[PDB]
Structure formats: C-alpha cells, structure tokens
C-alpha cells in the first residue's frame, strides 16, 4: 500500500527528538564506516594539500526508528536527513570541503526494519598533507585523511571500519599523473583532548613519485651543459676567445636553467636532492672555467706550452672520471 | 477561471508525500532524460577536465499529480519543485557543478493533465575526463559525461535516453578553439555496486586536436634553430670564435625554448611526441659542436674531410629522424 508506508513514516518521526542521540543514557552507539574513493585529483606541492572525492557511508543502529509490518527496505528521500540524527564526523585535515549538490544534495538515507540506518554522502575535501621534500623528487611520501567525531567523546560514540581491511575500496580507481599508490592502511584509535577522549579513524596512503619525467626535463640538460663545458678542453689554448665564450656561456646557461626551475617548488629551507645535483653541475662548470683561466695565466704571464698541454690532458682524463664518480655516488645514495 | 486553477493546484499538493517515490510498491518509475549542450567551454590539460553548460531535462509520470478540467498543461513557478518529488540524479565525472541562479534558481516545472511531469535545469559542470598524452599533440581524446541515480537502485528507478539517438542536441553548433568534436555517442547500461544495481547513462564525445598552431609555433622554432646550427659547418674551421659562438648560442636558444615551453601542459611521467622532437633537436644541435670539437682536436693534434662528410650526414640524418617521427605519430 501507499498510504500505509506514509503513515508509518509519519509515526516514526513523531516524537523523534533529533537533539538527543540514540541510546542517550545507555552505552555508546557504534558507527561503522565505509569509504569509496572516486579519485585523488590534485596533489599540489605549492599548497601542501591534495583533493579527494569519496562516497562516505556511515552505518549505525537507532532503535527509535525501528518499524514493523513493512518487510522491505526504506530507501527514503534524502531530504529526510534534515529531520534525523546523524553522527557529527569531520575530517581533521580538511582545508576546503563540500558535499556535492548537483541537481540534489547528494545524500542517501536507508532505514531497515531492525532500526539500522545507513547514511551516505558524496564528499570532496582538499585535505592537508604535510610532506618532507628532502629527497625530492626521489621521495616516498605519506598522506592521510583523519576522521574524528566532534561533539561526542568515546563514552558516547564508537568508530570502527565496517568490513575490516575491506572497508576502504576504489583504490584502483585512483590514477594520479606522477604518483603511484604503493599501499594504503587503516587505523583506529582514541585521541585525548582537553575536553576528553574522542574516537578517531585514519586512512593512510604511501605514494611513490615517478622519476622519468624529472630525468628527461631537469637532469640531462645539466649533464649536457657540463659536457658542453668539457668540450673546451679539446680546443687549442691559443684560441682564448673560443674557450672563454664556451665556458662563460655554459655558466650562464646553468644560471638560467637553475633560476627558471627553482620557482616551481615551494620555499623549502633545507636543500633538496635535486638542488644538490644542480649545485654540483654548477661547481663542475665553474671549475672548468677556473682551470682554463689558470692555464691561460700560467702560459701567457717550448717549455710552458708543454706544461699547458700536460694540464689540458690531465683535465681531460680527470673531469669525466670525477663527474662519473660523483654521479654514481649521488644516484646510489638516493636509490 | 483563475481561483479554479489555484484550488486545483492546492488539492494536488495537499496530502502529497515528497519522501515516497511514485509507485512505491509498483514497478520502477521510468525517467526519460534529455540534454541540450549550450557550449563546451575550456578544456584544460593542466586540470585534466572540461567545463560544460547544459539544459538538462527529465520527464517522468507521477499519478499523484494527475488533474482534469484544465486543458492547458501548467508551467508552474520553480518554487513548487520544493514541494514535489524529483529524481536524485547526479554526475560522476563532475568536480564542481552548480545550477545557475540569475534572478531565479534556473529551473522549470511543467505538469500535464495525464500526470506527466517535466523537470528542467540549466546546469554548469566541470567534468573530469582523463587524457592520454602519449600521442600529444597528435592525440585523440574520449571525454564522457555520466549520469547516475544516487540512492535509488534499478528496482526503484529506471533511465532511458528520451528521443533515442536524438536525445542530445546542439553538439554541431559548438566550435572549440583547438579541439574538434568528430562524434558523440549515447549509452545506457546498468552498473552493479555492492549495495545493488544502478541505472547509468553516458554521453561520450570524441575530440580531435586540430593541428595548425603547435605545428607552426612550436616545431618550427626548433627546426629552424637546428638548421642554424648546421650553418656552422660551411664556416671555415680557422674561425674558432665564430664556430663556438654559433654552436653554444644555438644550444642556449634551444634550452631557452625548452624551459619557456613548460607552460603548455602539466606534469606527466611518460615521454611525449613533443618532448621526443625537442630532445631530438637538442641532440642534433649538440652533435654539431661535438664534431666541431673533433675537427679542432684532429687538426691541432684531413679535417676539412670531417666537415665535408658532416655537411651531408647531418641533414640526411635529421631528415631520416623527421620522417620516422612523422610516420610513427601519424
């Protein structure tokens, strides 16, 4: 019947005090939770955050909403949530967040005859992810979404992951451009504040940053310009202008690429792994210019040309070896 | 004449339960959807999404709202939408969407004497469609707008593209700045979730990036600068200053282009056709200076040979590289 369900629903809400939680005087109510991640869209290093869209389902028991006679589920219109009690769970890490509201406020309410309520939301959060860029871009990062109840302490509400490790799903639906999710984790614990204890769930992701783009974009121009500087060794010392122009323009190019690539990342005091490599290449080209100047000073300021040739061949055999040693040490240290 | 319609509408709404869908125990309600695409706005590779504007209409049949004696089908004020049940339709690709509110919340409710209800909105969305940039800028794209019922399973609600293939209109009038809509496709299916089976509609556009801008403004600089590097061969080896200046400043210009063209499209791990071409041009300008260094080393340690052989080798090798690149990506 149609009117039977209507009057049953009207009877349910009658006498329902939304201000009081279920089992107000009794033991705490348990609230299982499920998360289905649609996607992790942004991961911004300038802002120290990441965007995350998810279907967030909560499931609890409310004996006040138990009904009989009707033997099937009640999938009610989601405006009914305006006149029902729901847990007040918030994400401690959120910065800007909202419930999607395209064509309707995206919510769902499902009441079962035994009184269990399932409440689903479609949430988007710009969660904060503090991150250490010491090993950037060869960095294995961690981010978290940190759920907690605001109003109710552990004596009034309990949180658990419904389904154990299978509570969080949709990880395969995440395809970030540069990051790859190595493995996720679920944690539950009680956090103590001044007011009192509070239940607290935590979803954690370990991301690995892809490196090939960083290589092709930032790194091999530096090695290329280093070998540009090295080319000055295989030029006759008499042609001073040629070696001068080559070395000085290599140094200029190093400065240009360094200052055009530095702005991308945030203002981080400690030197990143990439900055060490850029400084090393700068030092190498700078030493190439200095040793050429030393050769020029020794020569101009039979016998002297022999010394100049000896220094030139010594540099020729030393610079590639030293640079290869430095490069191998740098790569092995960070891998 | 006027109060009659007033009392009729009042009679329709009193005793109307918005919470319960039409035919609560009966078969599922069939919601016939319809779309008019006003304009596909910008499509940002950086954001990996596209902004869309659309008149979104949906028809269904609520027997509770049946009325007689009024042949004119009523176009009611949008506020009555608060008092009526409507489907819980939503989008999956959306990231930030809104209904326009210019002087009124842009909605329309049209009731018919048989009980049919037409519900129309003017929606603007930012739908996310992931793009494969391996063939960029010579790549095809598939961008889809998908529609679901959030709460009601297939047992309760059912969708269908009203008008069949003609459900979506206005695509032909759209003129994107770079992309070109080669075709659009409508699909209706049933997606099984843990909770149950849900009805799915999908509108998928195939986009082809018109190639008349990047080809002229990106590849041509690099090509001309490689030819510029080749010009150094014809200069005599004795003019060391001219040769090294030309080679090193060609390298400087190439890296300047490389570091100034990074504002085109975002961070992605794999190699791109544009990146492959830039890297080829970079190495081709580099081998000019390298072989010049070999010329100087051999001469001061016969060489005009090194140069002569180079004058025909470098253009031929670059032509082979260009033909391979164009055949592979076209």
């Amino acid at each position, epitope marked *: 019947n149609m009117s039977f369900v209507k009057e049953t629903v009207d009877k349910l809400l009658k006498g329902y005090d939304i201000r009081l939680r279920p089992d107000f005087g009794g033991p705490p109510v348990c609230v299982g939770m499920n998360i289905d991640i649609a996607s992790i869209d942004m991961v911004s290093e300038v802002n120290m955050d990441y965007t995350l869209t998810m279907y967030f389902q909560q499931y609890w028991r409310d004996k006040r909403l138990a009904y009989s006679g009707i033997p099937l589920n009640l999938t009610l219109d989601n405006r009914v949530a305006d006149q029902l009690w729901v847990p007040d769970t918030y994400f401690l890490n959120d910065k800007k967040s909202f419930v999607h509201g395209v064509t309707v406020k995206n919510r769902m309410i499902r009441l079962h005859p035994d009184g269990t309520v399932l409440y689903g939301l479609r949430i988007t959060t710009t969660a904060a992810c503090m991150m250490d860029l010491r090993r950037y871009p060869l960095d294995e990062q961690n981010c978290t979404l940190e759920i907690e109840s605001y109003g109710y302490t552990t004596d009034d509400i309990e949180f658990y992951w419904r389904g154990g490790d299978k509570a969080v799903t949709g990880v395969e639906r995440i395809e970030l451009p540069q990051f790859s999710i190595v493995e996720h984790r679920l944690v539950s614990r009680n956090v103590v504040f001044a007011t009192g204890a509070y239940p607290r769930l935590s979803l954690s992701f370990r991301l690995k940053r892809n490196i090939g783009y960083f290589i092709l974009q930032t790194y091999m121009p530096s090695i290329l310009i280093t070998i540009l500087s090295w080319v000055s060794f295989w030029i006759n010392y008499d042609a001073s202008a040629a070696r001068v122009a080559l070395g000085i323009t290599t140094v200029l190019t190093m400065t240009t690429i360094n200052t055009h690539l530095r702005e991308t990342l945030p203002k981080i005091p400690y030197v990143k792994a990439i900055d060490m490599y850029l400084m090393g290449c700068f030092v190498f080209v700078f030493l190439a210019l200095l040793e050429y100047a030393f050769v020029n000073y020794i020569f101009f300021s039979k016998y002297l040309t022999g010394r100049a040739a000896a220094i030139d061949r010594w540099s020729r055999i030393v610079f590639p070896f030293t640079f290869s040693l430095f490069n191998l040490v740098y790569w092995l240290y960070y891998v | 004449n006027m109060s009659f319609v007033k009392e009729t509408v009042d009679k329709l709404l009193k005793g109307y339960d918005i919470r319960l869908r039409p035919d609560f125990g009966g078969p599922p309600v069939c919601v016939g959807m319809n779309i008019d695409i006003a304009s596909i706005d910008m499509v940002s590779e950086v954001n990996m999404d596209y902004t869309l504007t659309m008149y979104f209409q949906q028809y269904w049949r609520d027997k509770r709202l049946a009325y007689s004696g009024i042949p004119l089908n009523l176009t009611l004020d949008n506020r009555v939408a608060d008092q009526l049940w409507v489907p819980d339709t939503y989008f999956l690709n959306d990231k930030k969407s809104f209904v326009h509110g210019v002087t009124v919340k842009n909605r329309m409710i049209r009731l018919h004497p048989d009980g049919t209800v037409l519900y129309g909105l003017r929606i603007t969305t930012t739908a996310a469609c992931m793009m494969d940039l391996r063939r960029y800028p010579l790549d095809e794209q598939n961008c*889809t707008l998908e529609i679901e019922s959030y709460g009601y399973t297939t047992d309760d609600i059912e969708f269908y593209w009203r008008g069949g293939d003609k459900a979506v209109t206005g695509v032909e009038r759209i003129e994107l700045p770079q992309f070109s809509i080669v075709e659009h496709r409508l699909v209706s299916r049933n997606v099984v979730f843990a909770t149950g089976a849900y009805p799915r509609l999908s509108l998928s556009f195939r986009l082809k990036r018109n190639i008349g801008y990047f080809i002229l403004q990106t590849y041509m600089p690099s090509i001309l600068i490689t030819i510029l590097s080749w010009v150094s061969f014809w200069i005599n080896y004795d003019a060391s200053a001219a040769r090294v200046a030309l080679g090193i400043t060609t390298v400087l210009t190439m890296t300047t282009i490389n570091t100034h063209l990074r504002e085109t499209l975002p961070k992605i791990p794999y190699v791109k056709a544009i990146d492959m071409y830039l890297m080829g041009c970079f190495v081709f300008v580099f081998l000019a200076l390298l072989e010049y260094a070999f010329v100087n080393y051999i001469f001061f340690s016969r060489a005009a040979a090194i140069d002569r052989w180079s004058r025909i080798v470098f253009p031929f090798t670059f032509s082979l590289f260009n033909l391979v690149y164009w055949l592979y990506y076209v």
Partner: nanobody, 105 residues
C-alpha cells in the same frame, strides 16, 4: 603454473584488468584484478598470498602466477577488462570484454 593475458586496442580506456575462474558446477567468481599502472592489485580472500598478478606494458600484457596449487582449483580461467567508471571490481557484469576460457587442471 603461469598464465598470460595479452591486450590490444584502446587499452587506455579500459585500465583495470581482472581474472575470473569457473568450475563446471561453480559459477564465475572474481579471482583478482590489477590497474593500468600496475602498482595497485586486489585478490579474493580464497586466493590470498598464493596467486600473483603482474603487469607489463611491453605488449600490454598481464601475468597470473599460481603457487601452492590444489585439486579444488581445476577450472577454466577468463581475463576481462573494465571501463573507467563501472563500479565494483568483484562483479562480472561490470567488465565489458572477456578472453577465451583457458582450462587448468
């Protein structure tokens, strides 16, 4: 034992690839799944830390490796592909294309 499932066509549009098995009486069930990138994989409870799924993009292939085989696993195996947005991974209805059943005993 080892099994290989190749892929050709618009593999980008169908990232997730899944493995199912079926006995002559028992119905099709979800054995495992792996994403496009391959960094994320999922397995059923009954095939935890005995099966393995790997992904290689040399020719758009995936490999299923069985360890600690048992007589109850004799069945025909299918390899299928899922769309970008098609819901849960555990239901055969979501997957669109299917590979020819390979018998294993």
């Amino acid at each position: 034992l080892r099994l290989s499932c190749a892929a050709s066509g618009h593999t980008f549009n169908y990232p997730i690839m899944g493995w199912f098995r079926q006995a002559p009486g028992k119905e099709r069930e979800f054995v495992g799944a792996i994403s496009w990138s391959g960094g994320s994989t999922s397995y059923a409870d009954s095939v935890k830390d005995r099966f393995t799924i790997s992904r290689d993009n040399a020719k758009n292939t995936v490999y299923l490796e069985m360890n600690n085989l048992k007589p109850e696993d004799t069945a025909v195996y299918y390899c299928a592909a899922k769309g970008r947005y098609s819901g849960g991974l555990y239901y055969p209805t979501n997957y669109d294309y299917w590979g020819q059943g390979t018998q294993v005993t």
